Design a protein around this ligand. Structure first.
Ligand code: HEM
Ligand code: NO2
Ligand code: NO2
Length: 151
């Protein structure tokens, strides 16, 4: 149920991310990993990383950050009409990576943190409202896919 004004806010925020997708993606994964160390353990690709310095130094962590946020940007730009884009992420995250929905909530929290940290006094309360709505929609739709699959 996001309004057009709300989707406009979400995509105006996302334009901030797009100016440095690798920077934002890295910061988000690092915030996630250090706030909820159980999440790192889901990444066989990254679980050798122990310290924040090692995470910050990982070029491959940046690369994956780009992959993840590129998908999210594509989803957001569909303005809720994201059945096709969301299906493959639902399947992979439920059944292959085995990511609890709770972890997607932590991922959403990390995005909001990173946006405030990178854009202090430039991430408006209206835009925080709208981004929350957009992420909540994404989680709701993914979660239904997980339920279907017994997850
Ligand atoms: C905004 C939410 C998320 C988006 C948009 C996203 C997107 C993606 C994309 C596009 C891929 C590569 C294609 C795929 O395997 O489906 C991927 C891989 C993966 N994601 Fe996510 N993801 C999200 C959340 C999470 C969370 C919260 C976790 C774990 C706590 C996670 C764990 C993984 C893992 C393990 C892989 C495979 C990485 C590899 O070994 O190469 N994802 N994700
Ligand atoms: O960065 N999550 O795939
Ligand atoms: O990372 N959540 O504050």
């Amino acid at each position: 149920v996001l309004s057009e004004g709300e989707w406009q806010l979400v995509l105006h925020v996302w334009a901030k991310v797009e100016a440095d997708v690798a920077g934002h993606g890295q910061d988000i994964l690092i915030r996630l990993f250090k706030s909820h160390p159980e999440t790192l353990e889901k990444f066989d690709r990254f679980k050798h990383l122990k310290t924040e310095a090692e995470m910050k130094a990982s070029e491959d962590l940046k690369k994956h950050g780009v992959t993840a946020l590129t998908a999210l940007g594509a989803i957001l730009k569909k303005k809720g009409h994201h059945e096709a884009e969301l299906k493959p992420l639902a399947q992979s995250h439920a059944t292959k990576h085995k990511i609890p929905i709770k972890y997607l909530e932590f991922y959403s929290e990390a995005i909001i943190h990173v946006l405030h940290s990178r854009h202090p006094g430039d991430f408006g309360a209206d835009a925080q409202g709208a981004m929350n709505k957009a992420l909540e929609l994404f989680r709701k739709d993914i979660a239904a896919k997980y339920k279907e699959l017994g997850y």
